[PDB]
Each structure stands twice: as structure tokens, then as C-alpha cells.
Design an enzyme around this catalytic site. Structure first.
Site, mmCIF file in Angstrom:
data_model
loop_
_atom_site.group_PDB
_atom_site.id
_atom_site.type_symbol
_atom_site.label_atom_id
_atom_site.label_comp_id
_atom_site.label_asym_id
_atom_site.label_seq_id
_atom_site.Cartn_x
_atom_site.Cartn_y
_atom_site.Cartn_z
ATOM 1 N N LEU A 9 0.829 -1.198 0.000
ATOM 2 C CA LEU A 9 0.000 0.000 0.000
ATOM 3 C C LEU A 9 0.873 1.262 0.000
ATOM 4 O O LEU A 9 1.703 1.386 0.920
ATOM 5 C CB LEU A 9 -0.964 -0.035 1.191
ATOM 6 C CG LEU A 9 -2.136 -1.012 1.066
ATOM 7 C CD1 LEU A 9 -3.044 -0.933 2.280
ATOM 8 C CD2 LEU A 9 -2.944 -0.760 -0.195
ATOM 9 N N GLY A 10 2.539 5.449 3.196
ATOM 10 C CA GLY A 10 2.777 4.709 4.451
ATOM 11 C C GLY A 10 4.103 3.955 4.410
ATOM 12 O O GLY A 10 4.178 2.866 3.845
ATOM 13 N N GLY A 11 5.135 4.552 5.020
ATOM 14 C CA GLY A 11 6.476 3.987 5.037
ATOM 15 C C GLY A 11 6.743 3.149 6.286
ATOM 16 O O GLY A 11 6.247 3.465 7.366
ATOM 17 N N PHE A 12 7.528 2.075 6.107
ATOM 18 C CA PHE A 12 7.962 1.161 7.159
ATOM 19 C C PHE A 12 6.796 0.325 7.689
ATOM 20 O O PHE A 12 6.953 -0.399 8.673
ATOM 21 C CB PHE A 12 8.737 1.890 8.266
ATOM 22 N N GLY A 13 5.639 0.415 7.018
ATOM 23 C CA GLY A 13 4.452 -0.329 7.405
ATOM 24 C C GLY A 13 4.127 -1.429 6.398
ATOM 25 O O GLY A 13 3.947 -1.143 5.213
ATOM 26 N N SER A 14 4.029 -2.674 6.891
ATOM 27 C CA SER A 14 3.919 -3.844 6.032
ATOM 28 C C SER A 14 2.457 -4.233 5.819
ATOM 29 O O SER A 14 1.995 -5.245 6.342
ATOM 30 C CB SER A 14 4.739 -4.982 6.581
ATOM 31 O OG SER A 14 6.080 -4.573 6.823
ATOM 32 N N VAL A 15 1.738 -3.429 5.022
ATOM 33 C CA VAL A 15 0.312 -3.627 4.789
ATOM 34 C C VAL A 15 0.058 -3.747 3.290
ATOM 35 O O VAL A 15 0.506 -2.904 2.515
ATOM 36 C CB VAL A 15 -0.537 -2.496 5.398
ATOM 37 C CG1 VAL A 15 -2.025 -2.758 5.214
ATOM 38 C CG2 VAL A 15 -0.216 -2.285 6.868
ATOM 39 N N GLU A 84 -10.819 -4.507 7.354
ATOM 40 C CA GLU A 84 -11.692 -4.032 6.295
ATOM 41 C C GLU A 84 -10.975 -2.920 5.536
ATOM 42 O O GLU A 84 -10.162 -2.194 6.105
ATOM 43 C CB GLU A 84 -13.083 -3.653 6.815
ATOM 44 C CG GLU A 84 -13.100 -2.568 7.880
ATOM 45 C CD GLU A 84 -14.487 -2.145 8.346
ATOM 46 O OE1 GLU A 84 -15.475 -2.823 7.978
ATOM 47 O OE2 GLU A 84 -14.582 -1.131 9.077
ATOM 48 N N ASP A 130 -1.506 6.764 19.140
ATOM 49 C CA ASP A 130 -0.860 7.226 17.918
ATOM 50 C C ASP A 130 -1.865 7.927 17.002
ATOM 51 O O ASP A 130 -1.899 7.686 15.793
ATOM 52 C CB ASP A 130 -0.094 6.091 17.232
ATOM 53 C CG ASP A 130 0.858 6.570 16.150
ATOM 54 O OD1 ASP A 130 1.292 7.746 16.212
ATOM 55 O OD2 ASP A 130 1.150 5.763 15.246
HETATM 56 C C1 LIG Z 1 0.785 0.492 9.712
HETATM 57 C C2 LIG Z 1 -0.659 0.123 9.588
HETATM 58 O O1 LIG Z 1 -1.263 -0.534 10.424
HETATM 59 N N1 LIG Z 1 -1.276 0.576 8.457
HETATM 60 C C3 LIG Z 1 -2.582 0.314 8.098
HETATM 61 C C4 LIG Z 1 -3.241 0.747 6.907
HETATM 62 C C5 LIG Z 1 -4.585 0.265 6.812
HETATM 63 C C6 LIG Z 1 -5.541 0.453 5.783
HETATM 64 C C7 LIG Z 1 -5.258 1.245 4.561
HETATM 65 C C8 LIG Z 1 -4.280 2.185 4.365
HETATM 66 C C9 LIG Z 1 -4.381 2.844 3.129
HETATM 67 C C10 LIG Z 1 -5.274 2.239 2.294
HETATM 68 C C11 LIG Z 1 -5.503 2.414 0.826
HETATM 69 O O2 LIG Z 1 -6.289 1.683 0.220
HETATM 70 N N2 LIG Z 1 -4.780 3.386 0.239
HETATM 71 C C12 LIG Z 1 -4.668 3.561 -1.198
HETATM 72 C C13 LIG Z 1 -4.430 4.934 -1.724
HETATM 73 C C14 LIG Z 1 -5.756 4.286 -1.912
HETATM 74 S S1 LIG Z 1 -6.231 1.085 3.144
HETATM 75 C C15 LIG Z 1 -6.781 -0.138 5.938
HETATM 76 C C16 LIG Z 1 -7.113 -0.886 7.054
HETATM 77 C C17 LIG Z 1 -6.203 -1.080 8.066
HETATM 78 C C18 LIG Z 1 -4.938 -0.504 7.946
HETATM 79 S S2 LIG Z 1 -3.652 -0.620 9.106
#
Ligand SMILES: CC(=O)Nc1cc2c(-c3ccc(C(=O)NC4CC4)s3)cccc2s1
Lengths: 268, 7
Positions: A9, A10-15, A84, A130
Site C-alpha cells: 500500500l 505509508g512507510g515502514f508499514g507492512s500492509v 476491512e 498514535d
Molecule cells: C501500519 C498500519 O497498520 N497501516 C494500516 C493501513 C490500513 C488500511 C489502509 C491504508 C491505506 C489504504 C488504501 O487503500 N490506500 C490507497 C491509496 C488508496 S487502506 C486499511 C485498514 C487497516 C490498515 S492498518
């Protein structure tokens, strides 16, 4: 196997981005490295899991203000969380970057939504720790804000906290110089940083000296009511900060828009 | 300059 993984997908975050193949539902797939987990929790089952899973479980009662945990898995060296994913969504950080300082009306709607979400956390015994624009998602269609990322969270307690691994520029003075804070008062402080951020287009402090300073300078035209509330939240003495009731009873907070109205007026 | 901050 239940979900199809996609791109980061937010740096250093594994999502990652994901789809549940069962109902073709958009999800987010967060991986947490077991060796990086600082705060460990315990389930009712006695299962040792990361604090984050405990906190997400407690707050996931179907109040749309917090991103719900849909599922989780254990792996040899990691945990995997299914959350979600609204569509379409943009995080508030990117949103402020792209739009600059927000009109008070929109800021009001957003802020209120964030407060409701934080209150719900607290009612569920969870402290986020946070709160920041990066950690708030906007459902652009519904005009609903959703709080994310409980990786720095803790169980809410009415006693003093002596640990912190949230965002420093959002942390309160008492933390900076004493290494101690109270949850609710810390939260209010960070909410003050957040509100400044919405109305000014960026956070007020970058350096510990500024934080400790409690000098709030306005770069943008901001109304008196809003300045008052911001200054109040960013009071140096935790005891001087407003409660959530006081925040929500503030003149600036009157006449909030429904998420729906917000979408129509501000996001479509 | 406006930027993201780490946890
Ligand atoms: C570090 C961490 O927990 N990060 C997280 C991100 C998310 C997200 C999202 C972050 C950006 C999103 C996205 O679709 N961005 C695209 C530009 C459209 S979804 C959704 C649900 C839980 C978490 S937890």
C-alpha cells in the site's frame, strides 16, 4: 487461501491490498514480525498474541468509526491481520497535503468523527496512543472517517504510563521531559495537534523545544473559537486540558455535518 | 516542508 494478496500500500508499514475470494470483499492484510513485537497481549483462550489483536478485538463491535479486524492468523515468524478496506479511500495525511488547510466546516465534521471514534476506543478499554492524520482513513463515498493502526496502542488504564512508541511530534510535553503521561490527557494533546493540522495544513511543532514551549502560532486564518479549542487541548499542564465532554461542548464543535452531508459538500 | 513521521 481465503484471500487473494495484492500490491503493497505509508512507510515502514507492512500492509498489502487484498480481496476475500468468498464475497469479493476489499481487505487490508497487515503483517507483524514476531521479533519486532514490543508489547505482547493474551487472549481469553490464553493464546499469546500482539497487543494490537487484543485491542482490535475489543473495539470491533460494529461501530464504523474504527477499522474492524475481520480475521487474524499465526505464522512461524509473524502474525497476519485482515482488516476491512473502504473503497475509495484516502488517508487524512495525503488529503491535507493535497488540499492544504481545510475549511473549518470540513475540519469540524472530521474532528467530531475522530472524537466519537476515540471515545469508543476508551469505552472499550483501548488507548490508541498514535492519533495522527496518517492513522485516519476517509471513506470518500460515505464521508466516514475510520481510525487505523493500533500497533502503538495499549489497554486503557487510569494510572500513569511510562512507555511510548507512538509519533513523537504528536506526543505531549509531559512525555518529552518526564517520560510519563496519562492516556486521556495525552490523547487530548494529540487531538490538538491533529486539529491544528487540519486547519493549518500541517502540525505546529517539529522539535522537542517547540513541544515543551507550548507556543501556538497560527500560519493561516483560523477562527477565534477554533484557536481557543486548539490552545486548550495543547495546554502544557495535562490537568488544564479539556475532557472529551468539554471538547464536544465547545462552541466550535456546535452544528456538525452528518458524514453523508460532508461527502456531498466536500468530497464529491 | 510537510512530511510523515515514524512511530
Ligand atoms: C501500519 C498500519 O497498520 N497501516 C494500516 C493501513 C490500513 C488500511 C489502509 C491504508 C491505506 C489504504 C488504501 O487503500 N490506500 C490507497 C491509496 C488508496 S487502506 C486499511 C485498514 C487497516 C490498515 S492498518
Amino acid at each position: 487461501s481465503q484471500y487473494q494478496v495484492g500490491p503493497l500500500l505509508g512507510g515502514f508499514g507492512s500492509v498489502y491490498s487484498g480481496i476475500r475470494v468468498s464475497d469479493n470483499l476489499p481487505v487490508a492484510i497487515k503483517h507483524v514480525e514476531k521479533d519486532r513485537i514490543s508489547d505482547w497481549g493474551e487472549l481469553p483462550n490464553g493464546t499469546r498474541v500482539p497487543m494490537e489483536v487484543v485491542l482490535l478485538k475489543k473495539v470491533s463491535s460494529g461501530f464504523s468509526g474504527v477499522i474492524r479486524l475481520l480475521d487474524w492468523f499465526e505464522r512461524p515468524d509473524s502474525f497476519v491481520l485482515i482488516l476491512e478496506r473502504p473503497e475509495p479511500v484516502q488517508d487524512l495525511f495525503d488529503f491535507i497535503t493535497e488540499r492544504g488547510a481545510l475549511q473549518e466546516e470540513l475540519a469540524r465534521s472530521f474532528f467530531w468523527q475522530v472524537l466519537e471514534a476515540v471515545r469508543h476506543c476508551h469505552n472499550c478499554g483501548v488507548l490508541h496512543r498514535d492519533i495522527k492524520d496518517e492513522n485516519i482513513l476517509i471513506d470518500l463515498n460515505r464521508g466516514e472517517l475510520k481510525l487505523i493502526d493500533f500497533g502503538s496502542g495499549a489497554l486503557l488504564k487510569d494510572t500513569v504510563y511510562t512507555d511510548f512508541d507512538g509519533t513523537r511530534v504528536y506526543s505531549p510535553p509531559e512525555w518529552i521531559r518526564y517520560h510519563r503521561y496519562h492516556g486521556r490527557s495525552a490523547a487530548v494533546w494529540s487531538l490538538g495537534i491533529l486539529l491544528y493540522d487540519m486547519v493549518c495544513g500541517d502540525i505546529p511543532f517539529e522539535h522537542d523545544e517547540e513541544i515543551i514551549g507550548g507556543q501556538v502560532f497560527f500560519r493561516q486564518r483560523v477562527s477565534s473559537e477554533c484557536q481557543h479549542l486548539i490552545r486548550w487541548c495543547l495546554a502544557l499542564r495535562p490537568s488544564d486540558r479539556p475532557t472529551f465532554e468539554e471538547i464536544q461542548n465547545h462552541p466550535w464543535m456546535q452544528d456538525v455535518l452528518l458524514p453523508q452531508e460532508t461527502a456531498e459538500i466536500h468530497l464529491h | 516542508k510537510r512530511r510523515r513521521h515514524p512511530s
